[PDB]
Each structure stands twice: as structure tokens, then as C-alpha cells.
């Protein structure tokens, strides 16, 4: 037993490791979206950079879980980072729709972890999730939803002019 | 009944007073460690100053509970501050081990208070503990654990050179 | 065929994708080393931060290959990022030895890619590898070798004082 | 034989002169595109200025070959600069398509020169081409390809609004 460990359930420790992996998975998916929008036959640079930024943010989320694990006396256990679900992302609307679903998947995992922490009476873990993850998730989901509404308004997927306009005025 | 009092259970009010006393007790223990390491036959000034800083921090924790009590309309009730468990602290490793146990004792009391606040449906008290106490406790416990690992690596208690090196490069 | 593609062999495109994956694998291995040295029972913070920095550098190397692929009109294809070979890294010497071998593995892959680029008469790819990868590899290998020599001089793995001294004066 | 001449094959000297001429030809083509987009019945000023900038860049490329020739002890031999293939350039998409093909033609000539330099075992000439020409070519080709993708997305050649938008947000 780690000398620092106090009120940290084995189940929570394991769930933190799984959450870390999911953050890394999300990062990798966003990196794929970056590379797609940087393709010469796609060429939406501001969209690409948005997803690149998101990729870096997700990596930061993962690293914060690593630090958390050690602070509580848990042990970081890593697993493979699975490649993204797709190799190409269609267009800005399709990519944003996938990003929304990804963000909701990550959010659900965070909420499930919060429920576990609650069940195990771990207020430190609850506080950590609330203060460092849950509000950022809601903000990101709202931003992506707002983008999707605008992409639909702009006539995506069919309206190429609309897609250009979004890249030039929304990101 | 205090004109400001709302959703503040008598049990929580009493537990806040006991928590205040424990913070003062912790402060006093750290002050003893400061004085020990400042002895001419001990003479580890950086270690002494670390514990002096910790003593002041614990006093601040106590004063914040006093302010909290009044904000909620509870009444501060003071008890004797018991002298520390020991009059001399052996060496840096022994002192750090005692500090770790002290920090875990304080942490357990904070967690118990959080559980009481939860049982009494007092989200303000829960928030206060989470935002002002629980993360600082985890950080401090991790720091002391890290120090202990390094002191053991440096050959404490036997290795006087190791102890000197710690004082000169870790604190 | 991509409108930008010129003098870019399919074999080189595929090898760039595999190289990208290897950079990501190296990044992930370094992230594991960071987490290990941040453990409360390991607690070598400067060593941990060295490996964290290395992890970020490797990720940058991977992203540069993504950008390269697109610049040439190749298509980024991602695969799983395999978890590191180990879950725990022993001590500073063992970790540095693994880092040296990892760096040499990455270097060999870069040299193999340079040989392929040479065989396919692709001077742009040769230049890219020489200007952006090969010298950094040699520098990193030399730095790690130098560290290993010093860790051995300091009596690793047995000499805990030596390990402490390295953390405090070399990184 | 020039007193400075060393390891500089006659074939390479001649090929450098031909490369110089091609750079001047490219410059002149871009100058024609500038003048076209500055016409009152075309009036896409940002597009015109892009091509004017490209024209100046190509002239700089030519002058660098002149300096190179002298540095190696070769002799600059000039030929007529042929007028561009066209007198009018249709629209932004047509001009960009011609620019892409021009850039690929120049790139192929640079790659052919690099192959000659390799065959004649001239590493100085290889280095010069790699460090001063080949990466700039790849960057320029990618930029123009990206523009073409966006012009097609914007409905060129038919969509005049799309063409206006490109001029106002892409260049
Ligand atoms: Cl526990
Ligand atoms: Cl699987
Ligand atoms: Cl595709
Ligand atoms: Cl928007
Ligand atoms: Cl009340
Ligand atoms: Cl008593
Ligand atoms: Cl004594
Ligand atoms: Cl020293
Ligand atoms: Cl330390
Ligand atoms: Cl090709
Ligand atoms: Cl496999
Ligand atoms: Cl272990
Ligand atoms: Cl060293
Ligand atoms: Cl010669
Ligand atoms: Cl002729
Ligand atoms: Cl005309
Ligand atoms: Cl564009
Ligand atoms: Fe995240
Ligand atoms: Fe798979
Ligand atoms: Fe996210
Ligand atoms: Fe709560
Ligand atoms: Fe909170
Ligand atoms: Fe964010
Ligand atoms: Fe985000
Ligand atoms: Fe305290
Ligand atoms: Fe007593
Ligand atoms: Fe404390
Ligand atoms: Fe503190
Ligand atoms: Fe403290
Ligand atoms: Fe690398
Ligand atoms: Fe595996
Ligand atoms: Fe590396
Ligand atoms: Fe580096
Ligand atoms: Fe490096
Ligand atoms: Fe020193
Ligand atoms: Fe040129
Ligand atoms: Fe003619
Ligand atoms: Fe050019
Ligand atoms: Fe340029
Ligand atoms: Fe150019
Ligand atoms: Mg467990
Ligand atoms: Mg998972
Ligand atoms: Mg917040
Ligand atoms: Mg009462
Ligand atoms: Mg008490
Ligand atoms: Mg906080
Ligand atoms: Mg292929
Ligand atoms: Mg591989
Ligand atoms: Mg270099
Ligand atoms: Mg000749
Ligand atoms: Mg010619
Ligand atoms: Mg260069």
C-alpha cells in the first residue's frame, strides 16, 4: 500500500486509468481530424488548427489524470491508444458531428467516474472532476453544437461556399 | 438562534470547532519540529524552516475555520491546544514520518467532517472543505511522502551525509 | 492522384506513416517514464520532468511527419499506439538504458527511411530527414549515453545517494 | 579553367544556366498574371498582388543561380526569356491551375538538376538545391493546390461571388 494512499478505492484507481486512456483516444481522434483538414484536397486550415488545438487539450487532460493518480498513491497503468474510428472525415459538418459525439462519450465517462467516486465516498475525486473536467466538457459540447447549427445553416454538406465561409469567419 | 443561521446543523458546528482545535494542534506540533531542527546539536536550518512554514500554514487553516463558523452563525468554542506527542524528533526522517501521520490524521478528520456535512445535506460546508482543505491535504501528503522516499534513498537514519544533502538540495 | 504529388513513391508514403507511429510510440514510452518517476515511492521529480519533456518532443516529431505527408500529397494513415514495453522502469539507470535503446531504434528507422528515399531518388525526403531528424537523434543519443556513464559512475543501481545526486545536479 | 573551379562538371554548369532561364520564364509568366488580374474588366487586386509577389520571388531564384554559377567558377550564359504561354488567364481558377503546372515544371527541372549533380558527385550543388530550392517548391505547390481546392469549393469558374470571396479572404 502506498504511504500516501488514503480513502482511494481500487475501483476508482482503475477507472482513472481507463479515463486516462479515453482522453488519449480523444486526442488521437482530433489529431486525425487535423491531418484530414490539412490535406491538399480538403484545405480548410482554420478547421484543421481548431482540431489540432483540441488534440493538444485532450493530451493535457490525460496528463492531469496521470498526475492525479500519483498524488493519490494509485499506479498509472497504460493501455494501447486505439486508432480513430475513421481514416477520413468527410467535411467540416461530419467532423463536427463526430467531435460532438466524442465529447459526449468523454463526458459520460467523466459522469460515470463521478458517480463511482460518490458511491465510494471520495470527495477529493469528486472535486477534481467537477473543478477540472465537467465544466470544460459542457463548454466544449456547447461550442461544437453551436458550430453544427451554423454549418447546417450554411448549407453543409452540399454548400461549398458555406463551408468556406465557416472556415473564414467561425474558426 | 443567530439571525444569519440557515441550514447549519448543530453537529456540524461542533465538528468545525473540533477541526479548528486539530489544526491548532498540528500547528503546534510543527512549531516543535522547527525548534528541534534549530537546536545547535541538530542544526538543519532548511528543515527547521520547512516545519516553521508548515506551522504557520496550519494556524491559517485554524483561523479560516473561525471565520467560517461566524459566517454560518455558529459559535467558536475553544479548547486547550495539547502539546505535541514528543519533545524531540530524532532526525529528518523520523520527523517527516511523524508529519505524514499528522497530515493523514488531519485529512481523516476533514473527510469525516465532509461525510457529516453530506449526511446533514450542507453543500456550503462540503464546498468549503473541498475548495479550501481537501486538495491542499493531498498535495501536502504527497510532498511529505516524496521527501520520505528520498530520505530513505539517502540512507537515513544512519547516513549523516545523506541527511546533510537532503537539507541542502530538497528544502 | 493528389494534384500536388510529384516524385513521391508509394513506399515512401507508407514508410512515413510507419515512422509517424514509431514517434508516437516513443512519446508514449517517455510519458510512462514520467509517470513512474513521479510516483511517491520513486520521487525523482527532475528525472520525471526530463522524460515528460522528451515525450512532448516525440509528439512534435510525429506531428511534423503528418504535415510532411500532406505537403507531399501522401495520405496520413494512423494505427494503434502500442503501450510501452514496461509498466515500471526500475530506477534512473534502467530508464536511461531503455531510453538509449528506444532512441537507437527510432534512429535506425530514420536511417532506413533515408535509405529508402535514396533508393527512390527523393532528395526532398532525404533533406527533410537530415535537416529535421538525424542530427537531433545523434544529439539525444549522446546526451543519454553521457547520463548513463554518469549514473554508473555514481554507483547505480545500488547507490541511492548517487541517484539523488544525479537528479539534483544533472537534470 | 577558372582558378576557383573544383569538382564542377561542365554539364552541371550548363544545366544551371538552363535552370536560371526557367526561373526567369516563371517570373515573366507570373508578371503576366499580375497584369491580367489588374485589368479593369478583371479587377481582383489581391490575386494580382499574389502573382506580382510570386514574380519577384522567381526573379530572386534566378539571381541566386547567377551568384551560384560565379561562386563555382562557371560562366553565366543568358538566353531569351520566352513570353508566357498565354496573353490572358481566364479567371482565378485557370490562373492557379497554370501556376500549379508551372511550379511542377520548375520543380521537375530542379529534381533533374539534383539527379545530374548526384551523378556527377557534386555534393555542394546537391546541398544548394536542397537548402535553397526544393523545400520552397514543395511549399509553393502545396499552397497553390490548397487554393485550387478552395476555388473549386467556391464554385469557380461559374460562381462570381465565390471568386470575389476568395480574393477577399484567401489572399
Ligand atoms: Cl485507501
Ligand atoms: Cl482490443
Ligand atoms: Cl479519402
Ligand atoms: Cl459559427
Ligand atoms: Cl440552521
Ligand atoms: Cl484531556
Ligand atoms: Cl533530546
Ligand atoms: Cl552535492
Ligand atoms: Cl527530495
Ligand atoms: Cl509521385
Ligand atoms: Cl499487433
Ligand atoms: Cl511497480
Ligand atoms: Cl551527468
Ligand atoms: Cl572542375
Ligand atoms: Cl526558340
Ligand atoms: Cl482578353
Ligand atoms: Cl483558400
Ligand atoms: Fe478531454
Ligand atoms: Fe483495431
Ligand atoms: Fe474534449
Ligand atoms: Fe459535491
Ligand atoms: Fe467545487
Ligand atoms: Fe478547453
Ligand atoms: Fe476542449
Ligand atoms: Fe491543516
Ligand atoms: Fe497532557
Ligand atoms: Fe497540514
Ligand atoms: Fe500548503
Ligand atoms: Fe501545508
Ligand atoms: Fe523522435
Ligand atoms: Fe499489446
Ligand atoms: Fe527522441
Ligand atoms: Fe531535442
Ligand atoms: Fe529528443
Ligand atoms: Fe550539491
Ligand atoms: Fe523558382
Ligand atoms: Fe515565340
Ligand atoms: Fe516558384
Ligand atoms: Fe516562397
Ligand atoms: Fe514561391
Ligand atoms: Mg487495484
Ligand atoms: Mg476505454
Ligand atoms: Mg469551475
Ligand atoms: Mg449546538
Ligand atoms: Mg481533537
Ligand atoms: Mg480546488
Ligand atoms: Mg500507396
Ligand atoms: Mg512500427
Ligand atoms: Mg542541421
Ligand atoms: Mg562547359
Ligand atoms: Mg528551358
Ligand atoms: Mg531547408
Amino acid at each position: 500500500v502506498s504511504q500516501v494512499r488514503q480513502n482511494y478505492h481500487s475501483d476508482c484507481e482503475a477507472a482513472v486509468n481507463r479515463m486516462l486512456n479515453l482522453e488519449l483516444y480523444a486526442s488521437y481522434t482530433y489529431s486525425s481530424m487535423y491531418a484530414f483538414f490539412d490535406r491538399d484536397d480538403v484545405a480548410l486550415h482554420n478547421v484543421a488548427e481548431f482540431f489540432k488545438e483540441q488534440s493538444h487539450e485532450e493530451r493535457e487532460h490525460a496528463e492531469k489524470f496521470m498526475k492525479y493518480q500519483n498524488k493519490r498513491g494509485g499506479r498509472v497503468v497504460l493501455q494501447d491508444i486505439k486508432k480513430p474510428e475513421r481514416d477520413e472525415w468527410g467535411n467540416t459538418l461530419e467532423a463536427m458531428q463526430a467531435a460532438l459525439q466524442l465529447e459526449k462519450t468523454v463526458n459520460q465517462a467523466l459522469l460515470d467516474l463521478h458517480k463511482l467516486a460518490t458511491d465510494k465516498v471520495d470527495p477529493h475525486l469528486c472535486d477534481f472532476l467537477e473543478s477540472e473536467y465537467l465544466e470544460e466538457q459542457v463548454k466544449d459540447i456547447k461550442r461544437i453544437g453551436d458550430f453544427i447549427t451554423n454549418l447546417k445553416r450554411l448549407g453543409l454538406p452540399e454548400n461549398g461556399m458555406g463551408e468556406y465561409l465557416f472556415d473564414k469567419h467561425s474558426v
Side-chain angles (χ1 to χ4, degrees), chain A residues 1-58 60-84 86-114 116-171:
Chain A
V1 187
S2 163
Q3 73 190 322
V4 305
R5 201 194 186 106
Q6 186 169 31
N7 195 41
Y8 197 47
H9 198 282
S10 180
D11 291 359
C12 295
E13 178 183 355
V16 164
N17 284 330
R18 290 189 299 273
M19 194 67 231
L20 187 164
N21 186 267
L22 183 58
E23 297 284 5
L24 290 171
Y25 175 83
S27 179
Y28 203 24
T29 287
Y30 280 130
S31 78
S32 178
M33 292 182 183
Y34 154 71
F36 177 77
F37 289 97
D38 181 60
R39 284 168 54 157
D40 79 87
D41 53 0
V42 175
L44 294 161
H45 181 70
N46 290 338
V47 175
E49 293 303 324
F50 171 81
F51 290 128
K52 187 176 186 183
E53 283 157 9
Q54 292 290 281
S55 178
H56 294 172
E57 184 203 308
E58 301 294 352
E60 293 179 322
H61 298 165
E63 292 184 322
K64 186 173 284 193
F65 277 121
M66 288 186 188
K67 186 178 182 189
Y68 187 85
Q69 190 72 284
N70 280 333
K71 279 168 76 172
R72 292 300 300 278
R75 295 290 166 251
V76 172
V77 176
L78 301 174
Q79 301 299 340
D80 293 350
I81 307 164
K82 299 298 206 175
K83 71 194 184 77
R86 296 176 59 170
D87 292 322
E88 65 81 34
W89 299 97
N91 58 67
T92 308
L93 175 58
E94 280 195 30
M96 287 296 177
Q97 284 165 148
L100 180 63
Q101 291 315 121
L102 176 66
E103 291 291 335
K104 295 190 89 170
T105 295
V106 175
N107 199 33
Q108 192 58 62
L110 291 164
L111 293 169
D112 291 348
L113 183 50
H114 192 282
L116 178 62
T118 297
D119 293 346
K120 297 308 186 186
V121 198
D122 190 335
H124 187 272
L125 180 48
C126 286
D127 168 74
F128 176 64
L129 296 167
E130 289 163 50
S131 307
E132 303 301 323
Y133 294 87
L134 297 187
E135 160 66 354
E136 211 276 334
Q137 276 319 102
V138 160
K139 278 170 168 141
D140 285 356
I141 289 160
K142 179 62 162 66
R143 176 167 58 178
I144 296 163
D146 289 353
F147 282 157
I148 292 163
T149 295
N150 279 280
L151 288 155
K152 288 180 176 181
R153 157 183 298 125
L154 282 162
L156 276 283
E158 298 90 352
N159 200 319
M161 180 181 292
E163 193 165 14
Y164 178 86
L165 288 173
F166 178 91
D167 171 272
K168 295 296 184 178
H169 303 82
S170 288
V171 280

